[PDB]
From Swiss-Prot, chains A, B, C, D, E, F:
Database matches in InterPro entries: DsrEFH-like, Sulphur_relay_DsrE/F-like
Protein name listed in UniProt: Protein YchN
GO cellular component: cytosol; protein-containing complex
Cystine connections: none
Coiled-coil boundaries: none
Species this chain originates from: Escherichia coli (strain K12)
Protein family per UniProt: To M.jannaschii MJ0989.
One GO MF term: identical protein binding
Assembly and interaction partners: Homohexamer. The hexamer is formed by a dimer of trimers.
Gene3D superfamilies: DsrEFH-like (3.40.1260.10)
Length: 117, 117, 117, 117, 117, 117
């Protein structure tokens, strides 16, 4: 089975980077529905897992994540990063969970293609 | 007297940027006890107002904000930026609050200096 | 009145950087319609002056620039940056125009505040 | 053989990332004359496709793309991105073309490697 | 045996980029000792090879680079980047040498995965 | 006398940011031969003070710094930033010296305008 891992570093709404990331993932999912795709969000991107994002503009990062964690795409947030920005205890989007660098390593060594945004 | 406005745009911990502005601001206030100094956090930097910050390394953005909002230094988080990332309702640092673009234009115009970090 | 000069450096849509500089720009002129407010675009921001901008969603940088040039807010694109990107000869947003660094070093020397984004 | 996809988010000249992507791209080909190389440009790196780039300074992104397109290395510009910047209807450098996320999300699935700069 | 190349571009301490890049490399090495792991630094990352870093804060990039070269991991700094920055002839960390984009093209061609933080 | 301060954050060569700071400072230094212009470099911009920068490309940041120092323009490198990179003990440029935050707070306090890139 093809195993893809996308790791995002960009902060939500400030970097078009995080936005493109979730767009690729959502796209990759449809093309090859049977694809083992996982997501690890580092540094700034970690705040993306917060509930209640109410964008007035256009795209909604919470919505894009829910589209993924509804089709069963693992979405993890770096522990040290969420702990520093105080998001570990706050309400996170559904299929979004806290993860570690070690698991991220595991995914990396196990993946066939690792894309970094 | 002297009216100085500081505008941070960068995400907490992601880069030294927000850290420098807060670092400069504390330095300004420690050089002039009654300097009318106001902080305004936009875009990515709006997440710094979060309360549960617990880094475990070097600098603590929450702590730096508390050193500023205790010397009665206003610190505003841009309403739309907070509404976008779901921060408008969560617990924010002590004297940290939610302001509007109208307020920053209001500040800017009546200010002697406007350091835009 | 009061001379204020805004200087954007970020690429359009790539980051809130140039978007915020325009929101702040438009907002300043609403508080005071007399403001001798001037806009200068450097490097990557230079492409914002192009015509034909039709954003899939979210904000539209062209309109914002048009809403400024309509009030007569001088918007100048740096000559060197435009040449290297091939924006000089192409159709510009309106009462956008190609300016120079020598012009910036002047607005700066005669301004009251220089808001740098 | 081998399929290598290269993605780029960086704005020409303002950043270094885009320049590096192309330098590495031209290098990969020089190593393997037959290397199946595909270049996708998202967000900001999309203005890099404009014709008439003539910087009096250092590198010339236009030339680096012609070096790659002369070899028939496909270079696709993201549709949604180009539309937002009003570059869709402008004259693009030869081999440069307007592609879609759907395509990137396909090249990715059928590639041994994907470098994302 | 696995061939994994990690490329980094972010200046040290300035962003988390280069930091999480080395952190992930150290964790990958701790996972599988017999992993063919290569480190290549371009642009601003090139200055991380400098000896004598004395950060009084938290993470120390020099120590992270030494922990890697200790486990016999190659670490080459881009030659053209180092020349223009004045680093090509300064004291470098223990196992850090100057490399070439030609060497990076070789690495990427024979690598199973190429991570680009 | 007009007192202007330029605070730079960008890494040399990795971005145009630092470049424009120096260029706009040299511009300011020529139009007003009798102005008090001061330069402070924080973060990644700090390594711009090293000697021996021989870029084979375009602009040479060492030269731009010499043209300013030659004109008695104070160039200070943040002390803690230079400690972390190990530049505090390395050979610095002609008139480039190591400075502190406290000093910057003072420059900002006695300045008419402060430009930050």
């Amino acid at each position: 089975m093809q195993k893809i891992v996308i790791v995002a570093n960009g902060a939500p709404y400030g970097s078009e980077s995080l936005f493109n990331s979730l767009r690729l993932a959502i796209a990759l999912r449809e093309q090859e529905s049977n694809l083992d795709l996982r997501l690890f969000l580092m540094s700034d991107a970690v705040t993306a897992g917060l509930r209640g994002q109410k964008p007035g503009e256009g795209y909604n990062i919470q919505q894009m994540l829910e589209i993924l964690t509804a089709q069963n795409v693992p979405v993890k947030l770096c522990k040290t990063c969420t702990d520093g920005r105080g998001i570990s205890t706050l309400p996170l989007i559904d299929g979004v969970e806290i993860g570690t660098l070690v698991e991220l390593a595991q995914w990396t060594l196990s993946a066939d293609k690792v894309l970094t945004f």
